[PDB]
Amino acid sequence: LDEAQTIESELDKQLRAANKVTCVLDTELTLARAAERKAQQTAQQGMKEEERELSASHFPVVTLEQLPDIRDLERQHERGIQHEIERVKAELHRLNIELT
Amino acid sequence: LWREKINLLNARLAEAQTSEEQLQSQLDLQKKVVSDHMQRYLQV
Amino acid sequence: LWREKINLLNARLAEAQTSEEQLQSQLDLQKKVVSDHMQRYLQVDSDASVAKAKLDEAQTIESELDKQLRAANKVTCVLDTELTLARAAERKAQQTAQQGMKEEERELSASHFPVVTLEQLPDIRDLERQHERGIQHEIERVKAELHRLNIELT
């Protein structure tokens, strides 16, 4: 009877390990939900068809499992656009000086 | 991509929940065995 | 801040473990009724009748305490996940921090640079970009003014 109780406790320990796995997966799901809702409202701002086409033709997208790296794309692409917009503005300033 | 990730995470969680249910079944079986030794002492 | 997170989670997980231990003790006490009602029946409305009647009742009511214990395990799981995340993030944050800055640079920055909180820690790298972008916007504005004044100068 004591041995059977010990085996029952072992099975309860296995059940608790499964519960821990389930809770970890549920927390991963919660993190995914939080990220989705964070990206939700910004996605709902509505866009023109021309802007949508331009973004499609000018910006790539990360895959499903590599989704965490999407923020790297945001950073690098925004930095590159920051650089090139500044370059065109500097050219505009030099040309304005020449025109003056 | 995050909605897709949510779908994938739920699909993965399904296996964990099924494992939990099966371990519950095994725990019930072990409780029944414990109950058999439980009653054996009243039958000797 | 991630070091603070680690140090706080190390104790929050301990509190969760304490709750789990209390619920485990309660479940063991619930089983104790059945375990005692074994030897009561053999060691003697009588005691044997009470043991027989309440043996199954104690086992049946055990479901609630087990459910309470199962619910409490979730706190430990969430706290452990948070502790693992803090462990992962803190080392990278420190190694990036090893780039370093002179003390005078630290005071110069200290003029306006913020102190991020633990609750701000999850979004620390978005508030960072927010502050940096504000600084960049001011830079651009004064730069445009500089260029207008350069037009005047020419």
- The H-or-E segment that residue A9 falls in is helix A2-43
* Structure tokens, A55: 């973004």
Mutate which: C43, C55, C56, C67, vs B, most B CBs within 10 A: C55
Q: What does the alpha-carbon distance between residue B42 and residue C3 come to, in Å, rounded to a whole number? A: 59
Residue A33 in contact with residue B31, Cβ under 8 Å?
Answer: no
| Record: contact B2-A64, CB cut-off 8 A | no
* Structure tokens, C80: 């452990």
Mutate which: B20, B30, B39, B42, vs C, most C CBs within 10 A: B42
Q: What does the alpha-carbon distance between residue A32 and residue B6 come to, in Å, rounded to a whole number? A: 6
Question: How far lies C97's CA from each of C59, C92, C128, in Å?
Answer: 57, 8, 14
- The H-or-E segment that residue C73 falls in is helix C47-97
Q: What does the alpha-carbon distance between residue C136 and residue C152 come to, in Å, rounded to a whole number? A: 24
Beta strands of A1-100 (E only): which ranges?
Answer: none
The residues near C127 (Cβ < 8 Å, ≥ 6 apart) are C114, C116, C120
The residues near A5 (Cβ < 8 Å, ≥ 6 apart) are B34
Q: 10 Å Cβ neighbour count for A24? A: 17
Chains touching chain A through at least 3 C-beta pairs below 8 angstroms are: B, C
Q: Is C154 part of the contact surface with chain A (CB cutoff 8 Å)?
A: yes
Q: What does the alpha-carbon distance between residue A15 and residue B26 come to, in Å, rounded to a whole number? A: 9
Using what technique was this structure determined? cryo-EM
Question: How far lies C50's CA from each of A38, B44, C30, C53, C54, in Å?
Answer: 60, 20, 16, 5, 6
Q: What does the alpha-carbon distance between residue C97 and residue C106 come to, in Å, rounded to a whole number? A: 13
Closest CA to C42 of C54, C52, C32, C33: C52
Q: Is C104 helix (H, G, I), strand (E, B) or coil?
A: helix
Q: What does the alpha-carbon distance between residue C32 and residue C104 come to, in Å, rounded to a whole number? A: 68
Residue C101 in contact with residue C109, Cβ under 8 Å?
Answer: yes
Q: What does the alpha-carbon distance between residue C36 and residue C154 come to, in Å, rounded to a whole number? A: 101
Closest CA to C53 of C63, C62, C41, C65: C41
Closest CA to C81 of A29, B6, A13: A29
Q: What does the alpha-carbon distance between residue A27 and residue A16 come to, in Å, rounded to a whole number? A: 16
Q: What are phi and psi of A64, to 5 degrees?
A: -60, -60
The residues near B17 (Cβ < 8 Å, ≥ 6 apart) are A22
Q: What does the alpha-carbon distance between residue B41 and residue C42 come to, in Å, rounded to a whole number? A: 8
Torsion, CA A65, CA C120, CA C86, CA C98, rounded to 10: 100
Crossing angle for the helix pair C124-153 and A70-99, to the nearest 10 degrees: 10
Q: What does the alpha-carbon distance between residue C5 and residue C119 come to, in Å, rounded to a whole number? A: 9
Residue C118 in contact with residue C4, Cβ under 8 Å?
Answer: yes
Q: What does the alpha-carbon distance between residue C115 and residue C76 come to, in Å, rounded to a whole number? A: 30
Query: Could you say which DSSP state residue C120 is in?
Result: T
Q: What are phi and psi of C109, to 5 degrees?
A: -60, -40
Q: What is the DSSP string of A29-43?
A: HHHHHHHHHHHHHHH
Residue C25 in contact with residue B28, Cβ under 8 Å?
Answer: no
Q: What is the DSSP string of B1-44?
A: -HHHHHHHHHHHHHHHHHHHHHHHHHHHHHHHHHHHHHHHTT--
Residue keyed to tokens 């004064």: C142
Angle at C153 between CA C147 and CA C154, to 5 degrees: 95
Phi-psi category of C100—alpha, beta or left, where left has phi over 0 and alpha has psi -120 to 50?
left
User: C123-142 burial, b if ≥16 CB within 10 A, otherwise e?
Assistant: eeeeeeeeeeeeeeeeeeee
Q: Is C150 part of the contact surface with chain A (CB cutoff 8 Å)?
A: yes
Residue A81 in contact with residue A99, Cβ under 8 Å?
Answer: no
Q: What does the alpha-carbon distance between residue B6 and residue A27 come to, in Å, rounded to a whole number? A: 11
Q: What does the alpha-carbon distance between residue A67 and residue A32 come to, in Å, rounded to a whole number? A: 10
- The H-or-E segment that residue C102 falls in is none
